[PDB]
């Protein structure tokens, strides 16, 4: 009928936890004055900053 | 000195600095001595109104 | 001394309750669940709200299952305390429930109060009044707030949650309609109430939010629920007569495994009216006093429990011609099916008959399948109405087989089955395994 | 003819229900369980009880395992019938439980009004409040034993029964806090009553004494229960007013795995007022005659469902930075959030949110972990305190979002949170698993 | 939204969600031997 | 306790250390690692009538003057360790 | 009590009875001195 | 507990180490300036560790 | 009124009585009040009604 794709609940690809996450990034980095690592690597904090899937089969 | 300085930023005053550890190794006292433990048969009694004879 | 004295009172006959002990009582296992959270949501109305009107909402897919529906209203009083009876109820019309196109069930105002009288109780159907009605003696002008809770079996337990997440091709949507009019709200018996506001109306759903394993399941395997439905067929009553006892035989259009059937006799007129008026407090306006009018109720006080003013005097089902059970007393059906079936207390005028051990539960436990029955039929005796209505002598000191004149006035007849089916998810659709 | 009419009624479509059955209806099974018994046993409370005094008591080690904890108090009258409402949980101003020096709990004597006005219900609730006020139309000088039972998580169910046996090394204390005053009893509003009577108190503790079996087990092996706490904190209302619907926005100190918030506004003077006075019937002292005074409660009806009188307009729970739910009106709070999640009816003034979707059980089912929030914000909006209270036609004819003149009294705000902890028993001791 | 919560777990959780056995959201009910009730009248002997 | 000198009525001191009064730490509160740290307080009623020295001499614990609501504004201080690094001909603080 | 367990219970009843009944001559007069004014003491006076 | 009277408490088990004891004490004249002298260190006639 | 204690493990930390050490044994602390507080309860030999 309908053809409606997804569910229209934010969480698709919104990063909706606390602050306690900058601390978590700070786990996969140096634990310290950090604010060189994302002030240089935007690659790798972009990398470091993706969403995941899990596909439903019709 | 002026900007490798660590600040109080956000993440370090999280609850669970706190609340994800227990308070129980900083307030509970060293036992090392067996609890004790006896049969109900052994401070009520044997119930004397068995049989006579 | 002291609870060992009771410990070691121990013998043969202590043996099948304690003796190579299964249980106990004074540690619980607790059951580690699933991660998962609950948001209400406002849906969007499309639509006009108004009284007549129709209106419908899309569920919207915010979460990955729901459950409890509200639907508020907000009405003002068009007159005092007492000229009101579940208004919010009257209001709600009726409500459909529809998934992918096709109705699944559907209820109406009335079901609401028949339900209501037969299955909530207590404080439960205290603060479910507070919900619908003005009772803490409002006054014309006052402005409240409704919440109707519906009733469609996702409202009613998590374990029937509908997996929106499943149905990546079906809306699920409710339509609504909006009563024409609302008693002690914009009509007073058959008077309009001149500057009567129309209704503000929103529809708020409780979306359930899953972690990712339990989401991931629900999206894509197959489900079978197993539902509620409502069969509900309107019919006239055999018109109540003060000469003799009225007396009908109604067949039942139903079909399904049915948990059980439900009835009430009213006058239409009056939402909410299951029994006769009279001259006694409560069961009229200005009832007690010389200005006491036996054709008008008290609106506040339109229920009762006084099975005298009810019309049925006695009812049996027939299946395929057979009697099912030895016809029993109106009493029986409104105090004694409910006592022994439920545990709640249903005001006179309404009546249940169980198949079910536990009509009230979630759980199947007992149905008649009325697909298996070519010829289901109630049959229903009425009371002799020649109770003179406005003579609280007469009215409270007759006999079991009568009841008052002004009962000829409960002239509809509603008749109610909830049966057992089968909701099937896959693939994006919903379906029903069963059409009849 | 008969019930065979309707087992023939057989078909395709009943196979979903009775085919291939897994059970039978007709027959009930029990299970065998330990031999135990119960005895109700009288503690020694130490300090003076009293107006105003801090007492406590240590739970003797009689039995093995302990529920029910029942507060015995005699109160005597100090005026006639309505002057006092449920004086024995107003005397009872609050009770700590500490294990081995830790503090596991705390309850409060507007939690318990609060918890009651939200989870007691239908006779459970009247019985109750034939335990804790005068319900019969008792005159001045009428003397009544009252029962305070507890509420901290082994008073509910024999399921969580504290351990004492596996408590070996270390003790358990109650500390109740009575109250400085006790409305009708010892003082009238403010003023003292002259010749008001101490009350007589004393704690009840019902043992479970365990046969040989589960006796050796418990003392022998290492527990873990998961239970209830209580966190609480008061803070003041914005005052609403006439003119102006106020706001506020207020942090939540709470943490752990939260089943449920609630919250109450209330005038601090007047014992579980949670409504504004009013001129209508029962809604303050003399109402419906001349003498109707809104300044004064009917204390035996201080109470009301009736939301008119009630101070919130509005109110959302903001989590991080993000509405947790749509604002919704303060009447969903009080009257469809406990209908949903409880199934009783909760008094004007008196509001519930849930994160769970049972929290009047002791299984958890959904709950909120604050320790995981770094803002948790309860949004209020007040109404307009316009309404001449001493009018009820003011009163019982207003709109939606307007309240008594009166309702401005109500500036205190009790915010309660129950939640989620272990107690750890083991070699002996106890304490709990999160901090 | 309710999304905000799902994702505030911790250690606190472990002991309700962790290694989860059971949820909320799948009622199976059980199949059962199919009867029928009905109420009927005894004979009473004597006055 | 912490100090041993005498402190003028309407002063007030919470020590979370020994000896506060050195410069040796002796015990401190982290709030770096504190997200709600809050001071409760509860007032006297003013009652008395601070016109009558009787008044204020002759009465109970909870209660002060009526002059005492003149005292409007309220003052909070702590007082903490840092450090100050000093390297290479320059100064500044380890933390903020 | 010991451990728990009631061992027994004495009654200012029987202590009286008891002493009816097994004290005797001076050990019982000795006895009423430690817990009686038995000197035609007056009243405000304190004893232990 | 009051005037004659003898009291006494157990240290709970706390915390882990004890070190000062204030003992709290609220008392009320009995006359006018100049009647006491040092009536809570009097009224504490002893106390045995 | 306030009374500091002064035993030994009142005056310096450096003695604090270790509860965390002290596993099986209590302390204890036993207080007499005094029959009489001059200004209190009474003033000189007469005492105050």
Known sequence: FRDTASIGFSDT?????????????????????????????????????????????? | LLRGFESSLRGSRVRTQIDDKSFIPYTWQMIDVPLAAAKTSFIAGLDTRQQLA | A???????????????????????????VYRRYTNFAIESIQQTINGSVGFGNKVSTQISRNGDLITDIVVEFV???????????????????????????????????????????????????????????????????????????????????????????????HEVKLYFTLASQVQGVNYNGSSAIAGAAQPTMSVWVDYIFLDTQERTRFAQLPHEYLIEQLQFTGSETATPSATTQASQNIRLNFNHPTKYLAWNFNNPTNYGQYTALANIPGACSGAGTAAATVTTPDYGNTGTYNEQLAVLDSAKIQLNGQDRFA??????????????????????????????????????????????????????????????ATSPAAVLGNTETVTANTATLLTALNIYAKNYNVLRIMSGMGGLAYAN
């Open chain 1, 13 to 58: 690809h919104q990063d909706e936890k606390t602050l306690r996450f900058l601390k978590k990034q700070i786990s996969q980095f140096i634990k310290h004055l950090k604010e060189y690592y994302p002030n240089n690597e935007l690659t790798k904090k972009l990398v470091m900053k993706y969403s995941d899937v899990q596909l439903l089969p019709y």
């Open chain 3, 75 to 169: 009405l003002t009083k068009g007159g005092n305390g007492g000229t009101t009876y579940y208004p919010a109820e009257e209001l709600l019309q009726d409500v459909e429930l529809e998934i992918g196109g096709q109705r699944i069930d559907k209820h109406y105002n009335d079901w609401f109060r028949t339900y209501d009288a037969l299955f909530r109780m207590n404080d439960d159907r205290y603060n479910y009044r507070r919900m619908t009605d003005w009772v803490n003696n409002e006054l014309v002008g006052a402005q409240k707030r409704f919440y109707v809770p519906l009733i469609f079996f996702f409202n009613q337990t998590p374990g029937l949650a509908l997996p929106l997440i499943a149905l990546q091709y």
């Open chain 3, 2 to 28: 002291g609870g060992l004295s009771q410990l070691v009172a121990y013998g043969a006959q202590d043996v099948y309750l304690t003796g190579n002990p299964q249980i106990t009582f004074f540690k619980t």
């Open chain 3, 327 to 388: 016809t029993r007393k109106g009493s029986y059906f409104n105090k004694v099916q409910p006592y022994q079936s439920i545990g709640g207390v249903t005001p006179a005028g309404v009546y249940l008959y169980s198949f079910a051990l536990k009509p009230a539960g979630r759980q199947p436990s007992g149905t008649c399948n009325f697909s298996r029955i070519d010829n289901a039929t109630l049959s229903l005796t009425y009371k002799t109405c020649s109770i003179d």
